[PDB]
């Protein structure tokens, strides 16, 4: 059942479930209806039809994608913008690591996925190549899918915004989530900075500074404490995760050495080490904004 | 329909090499593993080794590693069976078998076999 | 993983039953396959998964057992049934092992 989903940031990425990934919010509620249900075909033979169990997936998947892209873009209150296409990219390329059995979250009706999925292309040692191709020669089709309701309500002004080869890369789940998080964190750090700024920025008297008396100052000081813990925490195991897989992988990602490599290419402005300050609680405007000294 | 052919029967002197071939049609060929197995006269089945057709990863049974070469040609969906230099004990019955999976994918089994190809080897 | 089956040949009339057993040396669970052969044809598999019926099988065949020891039984023998009956752990998915068959005699 593919609900309405959830405002953006609701609920923050999950690092207590798994404890060696970070989950984001938009992966847990990933539609998946009719991928959860498929059933066997008659056939009652040892060896069933497997081209056309193939293509019964695909148009399971379709379905699935279609509903995604649909509730993608109601979240995003139908406005056809980059941020709706990087939905679409971060969801296609989930669909794709759960089709080539490479994802990270193994909850609930993902493992039930996965055994249908088993049950069309086998387990042997080489079952993961034959899903790999099919999921490489689908991926197309099934971005398609994902714009249908974009494309369907533009009709004669619709324009190619999403660009179909950049949703198709194919790079491990880990890169996707660095990236979907960085975002994350870029809408979230002016607006939790701004929230100070309403309590402490300047100084009290001429000379005090307003976090060292002020509890308006102080209470804005401990959520920005919660916050960027938590931004902390999340880029930690995230690192780890990116770490054990990038040397755990011989497919290499010419450009890509270590998780600030990511940022860098997806976010504009994206400084490492204002960041890697930012994250610590040693950069510039948390120190005269929250610190007494 | 989906099928293996084996190649005609072979009568060979001791000393001569030998390939046998298999040929699938009805199935995608490189997304099965192919495996040979012999039957000597009046004995029963010994599984020789198996080959995936799509990149040629190979495993022999101990007892036949190294007496014999088991290879694939994807571009005419061929899996064959050769020797580099016969002995008359190599007189027997060769069948080629696709394996596949059941309904679940989890349970293997031989499923398409060859008619067979006997070889008798004799001076 | 060595495969042992037993006896190695049983005479029978037409309308008989007939059990053949087929031991593991270690346990594999319900991977095991069994294959008929008539003289002069390639084996058909018959059973897999220890119990399941290949289309086509008459239903007085079946096939019992988990872990080590496994059983086929034909609850009525027909006359095309005389034939030689091969098991198959399939437990270690691409190597294989075969055991060493049970032949069907008609009694008489």
């Known amino acids: 059942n593919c609900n309405y989903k959830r405002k953006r940031r609701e609920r923050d990425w999950d690092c207590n479930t798994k404890k060696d990934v970070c989950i984001p919010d938009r992966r847990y509620q990933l539609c998946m209806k009719e991928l959860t249900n498929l059933v066997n075909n008659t056939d009652t033979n040892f060896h069933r039809d497997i081209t056309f169990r193939k293509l019964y997936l695909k148009r399971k998947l379709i379905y699935d994608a279609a509903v995604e892209g649909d509730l993608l873009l109601k979240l995003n209150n139908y406005r056809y913008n980059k941020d709706f296409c990087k939905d679409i990219r971060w969801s296609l390329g989930d669909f794709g690591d759960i089709i080539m059995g490479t994802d990270m979250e193994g909850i609930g009706y993902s493992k039930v996925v996965e055994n249908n999925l088993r049950s069309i292309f086998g387990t042997d040692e080489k079952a993961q190549q034959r899903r790999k191709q099919w999921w490489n020669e689908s991926k197309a089709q099934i971005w398609t899918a994902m714009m249908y309701s974009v494309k369907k309500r533009l009709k004669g002004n619709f324009i190619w915004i999403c660009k179909l080869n950049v949703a198709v890369n194919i790079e491990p789940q880990i890169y996707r989530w660095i990236r979907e998080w960085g975002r994350d964190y870029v809408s979230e750090l002016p607006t939790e900075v701004q929230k100070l700024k309403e309590k402490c920025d300047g100084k009290i008297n001429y000379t005090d500074k307003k976090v060292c008396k002020v509890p308006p100052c102080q209470n804005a000081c401990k959520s920005y404490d919660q916050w960027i813990t938590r931004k902390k925490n999340q880029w930690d195991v995230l690192s780890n995760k990116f770490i054990s897989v990038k040397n755990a992988e011989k497919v290499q990602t010419a450009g890509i050495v270590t998780p600030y490599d990511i940022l860098k290419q997806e976010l504009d402005e994206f400084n490492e080490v204002a960041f890697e300050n930012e994250i610590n609680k040693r950069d510039g405007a948390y120190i005269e904004l929250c610190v007494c000294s | 329909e989906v099928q293996l052919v084996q190649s005609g029967a072979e009568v060979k002197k001791p000393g001569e090499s030998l390939k046998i071939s298999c040929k699938g049609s009805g199935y995608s060929f490189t997304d099965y593993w192919i495996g040979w197995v012999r039957q000597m006269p009046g004995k029963g089945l010994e599984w020789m080794g198996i080959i995936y057709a799509g990149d040629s990863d190979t495993r022999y049974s101990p007892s036949f590693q190294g007496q014999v070469t088991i290879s694939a040609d994807k571009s005419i969906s061929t899996a064959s069976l050769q020797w580099s230099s016969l002995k008359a004990s190599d007189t027997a019955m060769y069948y080629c078998?696709?394996?596949?999976?059941?309904?679940?994918?989890?349970?293997?089994?031989?499923?398409?076999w060859g008619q067979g190809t006997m070889v008798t080897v004799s001076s | 993983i060595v495969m042992t089956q037993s006896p190695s040949s049983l005479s029978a009339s037409v309308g008989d039953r007939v059990t053949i057993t087929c031991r593991a040396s270690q346990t594999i669970s319900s991977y095991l396959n069994w294959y008929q052969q008539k003289p002069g044809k390639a084996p058909k598999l018959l059973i897999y998964a220890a119990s399941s019926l290949q289309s086509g099988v008459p239903s007085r065949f079946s096939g019992s057992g988990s872990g080590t020891d496994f059983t086929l039984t034909i609850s009525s023998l027909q006359p095309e049934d005389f034939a030689t009956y091969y098991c198959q752990q399939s437990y270690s998915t691409p190597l294989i092992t075969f055991g060493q068959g049970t032949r069907l005699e008609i009694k008489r």
């Open positions: 078998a696709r394996l596949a999976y059941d309904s679940s994918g989890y349970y293997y089994a031989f499923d398409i």
